[PDB]
Write an enzyme that holds these catalytic residues in place. Sequence first.
Site, mmCIF file in Angstrom:
data_model
loop_
_atom_site.group_PDB
_atom_site.id
_atom_site.type_symbol
_atom_site.label_atom_id
_atom_site.label_comp_id
_atom_site.label_asym_id
_atom_site.label_seq_id
_atom_site.Cartn_x
_atom_site.Cartn_y
_atom_site.Cartn_z
ATOM 1 N N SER B 128 76.392 14.654 64.223
ATOM 2 C CA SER B 128 76.648 16.072 64.427
ATOM 3 C C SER B 128 75.966 16.543 65.703
ATOM 4 O O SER B 128 74.948 15.986 66.127
ATOM 5 C CB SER B 128 76.160 16.904 63.235
ATOM 6 O OG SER B 128 74.803 16.624 62.944
ATOM 7 N N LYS B 183 76.646 14.244 55.702
ATOM 8 C CA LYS B 183 77.411 14.871 56.776
ATOM 9 C C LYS B 183 78.482 15.797 56.214
ATOM 10 O O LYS B 183 78.751 16.863 56.783
ATOM 11 C CB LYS B 183 78.035 13.798 57.670
ATOM 12 C CG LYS B 183 78.055 14.144 59.157
ATOM 13 C CD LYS B 183 79.056 15.241 59.480
ATOM 14 C CE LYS B 183 78.988 15.638 60.944
ATOM 15 N NZ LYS B 183 79.336 14.503 61.841
ATOM 16 N N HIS B 186 76.723 18.790 55.164
ATOM 17 C CA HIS B 186 76.290 19.473 56.381
ATOM 18 C C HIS B 186 77.397 20.361 56.936
ATOM 19 O O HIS B 186 77.154 21.510 57.320
ATOM 20 C CB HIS B 186 75.850 18.453 57.430
ATOM 21 C CG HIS B 186 75.831 18.996 58.825
ATOM 22 N ND1 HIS B 186 76.930 18.949 59.656
ATOM 23 C CD2 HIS B 186 74.850 19.602 59.533
ATOM 24 C CE1 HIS B 186 76.626 19.501 60.816
ATOM 25 N NE2 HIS B 186 75.369 19.907 60.768
ATOM 26 N N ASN B 187 78.624 19.838 56.991
ATOM 27 C CA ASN B 187 79.736 20.636 57.495
ATOM 28 C C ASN B 187 80.083 21.765 56.533
ATOM 29 O O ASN B 187 80.439 22.867 56.968
ATOM 30 C CB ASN B 187 80.950 19.744 57.751
ATOM 31 C CG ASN B 187 80.692 18.705 58.827
ATOM 32 O OD1 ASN B 187 79.760 18.837 59.622
ATOM 33 N ND2 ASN B 187 81.521 17.669 58.862
ATOM 34 N N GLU B 190 77.887 24.423 57.250
ATOM 35 C CA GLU B 190 78.337 25.011 58.507
ATOM 36 C C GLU B 190 79.463 26.012 58.276
ATOM 37 O O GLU B 190 79.502 27.070 58.915
ATOM 38 C CB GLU B 190 78.778 23.909 59.470
ATOM 39 C CG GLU B 190 79.459 24.407 60.732
ATOM 40 C CD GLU B 190 79.841 23.278 61.666
ATOM 41 O OE1 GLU B 190 78.994 22.392 61.906
ATOM 42 O OE2 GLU B 190 80.991 23.270 62.153
#
EC number: 1.1.1.44
Lengths: 470, 469
Positions: B128, B183, B186-187, B190
């Site tokens: 990222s 990940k 994580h997105n 986001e």
Amino acid sequence: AQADIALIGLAVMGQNLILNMNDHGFVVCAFNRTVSKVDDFLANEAKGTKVVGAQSLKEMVSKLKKPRRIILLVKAGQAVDDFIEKLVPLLDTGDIIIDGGNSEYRDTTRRCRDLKAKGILFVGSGVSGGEEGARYGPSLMPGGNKEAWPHIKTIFQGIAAKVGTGEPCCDWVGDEGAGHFVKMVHNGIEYGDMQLICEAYHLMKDVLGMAQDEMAQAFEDWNKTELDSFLIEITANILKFQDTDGKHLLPKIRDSAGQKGTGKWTAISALEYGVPVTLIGEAVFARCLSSLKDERIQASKKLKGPQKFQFDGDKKSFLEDIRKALYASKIISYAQGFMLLRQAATEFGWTLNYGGIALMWRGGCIIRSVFLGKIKDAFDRNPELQNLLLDDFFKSAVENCQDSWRRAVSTGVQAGIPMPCFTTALSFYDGYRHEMLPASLIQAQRDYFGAHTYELLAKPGQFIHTNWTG
Amino acid sequence: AQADIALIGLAVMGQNLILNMNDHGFVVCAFNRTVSKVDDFLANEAKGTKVVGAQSLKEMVSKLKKPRRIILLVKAGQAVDDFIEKLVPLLDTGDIIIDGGNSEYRDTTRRCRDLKAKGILFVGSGVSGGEEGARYGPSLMPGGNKEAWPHIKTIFQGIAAKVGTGEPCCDWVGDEGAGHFVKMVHNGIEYGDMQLICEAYHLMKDVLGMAQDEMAQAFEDWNKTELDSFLIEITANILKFQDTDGKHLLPKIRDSAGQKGTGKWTAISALEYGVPVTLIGEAVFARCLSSLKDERIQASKKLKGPQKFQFDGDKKSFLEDIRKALYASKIISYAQGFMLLRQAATEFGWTLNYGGIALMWRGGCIIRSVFLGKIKDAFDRNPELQNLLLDDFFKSAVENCQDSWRRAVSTGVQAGIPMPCFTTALSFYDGYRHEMLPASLIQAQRDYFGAHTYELLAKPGQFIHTNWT
């Protein structure tokens, strides 16, 4: 050939459907993978009926009047495909196989095309109502190959639940197992109505400080207006229920709901197809939050709520704002449900009977309500309505409820009362009615750090990239 | 025996990583399926450096110091598996294959197990930081087979971003593509932080009637407090950005939020394992609702909202209430995310270091913020923390933001402003703090209309049915 139809799978669900067809004068040929249940079922709950049995698939096929009609009530999965593979060589071109189990719609679509090429009419039908429903009048949602509809229309509509105006709660849904997809969306809408009622019960218990039987009387009066439903009838009866000793039983029931309930797949299908079915997802997440009983017990000792709150207004006026907020949110839920049905019909190329779909939910199901009949009327005027929030009855109903809707939301927010479905229904309504949304800023961000490009409001379809830096 | 690492996929993402490793003293072997771009990359983007290249897979493998290490940055899906089958016969037992793309964790688990049997060490790592971060210090989340960690440990942490304490934003996260799950989450976070900013941007624009440059400075001043983040930084820069015609660029952009998958995958994973990740789910549904642009244009013409409303307060004191609502909703959002991380560690049997994950997100990635540093302290004080809300720093911050949180939510509701994430973050907090919820009714209903069973408070484990009829 003396039997009109056959049913495979002699379970309480399959048995009740057979007895239902027998009470309507149809000779049913019972069968099971273990033939032992045949003679067992024929000498008990079928002792003295027109029901016949068979000890082999060839015998069962040989006892049915053509076009032969087979109903499959076996466990969803490989069991259905096994019986289909064992039935195809025994059936003639034009025969009908009906899957009545809770099969995944992607499988029903695959079986529908594979059997259409072999000259067999496959039907994937949804059946809701439990055991008592399957005995005297279940909700049937058939779909797949409409060529088999003229033959099964007589038996299905005859045994289906009666709605009240004479029509049966069973019509053609769509092609390639759209009924099983309708059965799925039906399960998700159930989670919304139940959670929506729980949020209203929470407001009456913590904001108005009412008693149990006083809350039950409010629901009984709420079940005489636009909110006529079976879930509200049982809600009032549950609140008034008194245990062994005069004290009520509901405060004694644990505060944990299901965690692997089937309603989540409706929200997952919404995410897979990119449809904002927000209320159903909140109802699913709400049950999962309930399962964390031990975490919420420890959190109540450490986490605090809203300070210095007091309700100034009118207890009898707030009892009418909660009702209109419960009614307006329910409209938003069903509006999202038909959006998911619409997107699935576009993705696969189906032609859905949205008006009939509401009728099949209106009788025999748990979510049955006269409010579903108003959805049927709305889909009787245009059968092209791209959104329930775009027709006369629903658009006007919000216009009167939305003012008390925001009053119940604002009051519950300041009171610290969890209303996930009330707020997400109001949030979706404000978002859907805005021509301009802040999502343009999201596109500017994604292009800023990720160069994911963006479009211009006056030049769609053309993606450009901005320097932003230098 | 001349190159340290190999990277397949010569895109701006892969090229910046090669130059990143090359600007750190590592000889990188660049390769691509279309070898034309390989010689192009050696003549322009890598003009005058120790970057080498290969014209085939045989020539590439021949240049890797043993144990050979290959980084894959190809299109997610079959393109990764195709190269794996093309690479396994050319490798020896002990070599490392690194998948740096946004691959689904179930796939990465499948590649890890299948290559585990063939003596190949597979590493599914998340990358990222966009493209600017991919050349100076990205966030790397290596997971899969820990046997490959000692050989890739020195290289990954060398190019990864470093925080003010000197520790790298890259450490081993777990087994069988546990990093790709990190990940994915994580997105998903986001998605939440971006949607939370938009709900605050909408409240400034439609409730307080603020100007573009005024809201831009407001985010710049907010960036000096508890909400010091990179997304707030770029939000202020975007609001200030002027077009070549003199006008602002943002009001010209259409409001249709796209997505490449990791958003819905996070919300789908939450529903599957029964984790109430509500805010991320609302952020994903918000992008779907914005994609219905033409449908909303017609809906705005026929549907009426609230019209009898005007803000009769303090435009300065309410702007601060929007700030606390954003900070408190961001706390609930990250609390839901780590609940999903802890459930995955239980479902799959992984050993995730939640404090370390916050450190790996504390620099390089998109959701980087000083707020993520406070999360590291939360798990450094208690690595077995059952919930982020049970921490003193966050329970006190929510207490200090609660009044302004509700005041802004109530005002936005009266205004008719869409706040799906602010409202779902508040409804989740009020629910998570209540010892008694209405779920006793939602389960008493199932026992009523069906043969389902319920429990009692004084007997957990026994299921009862009542003859309600």
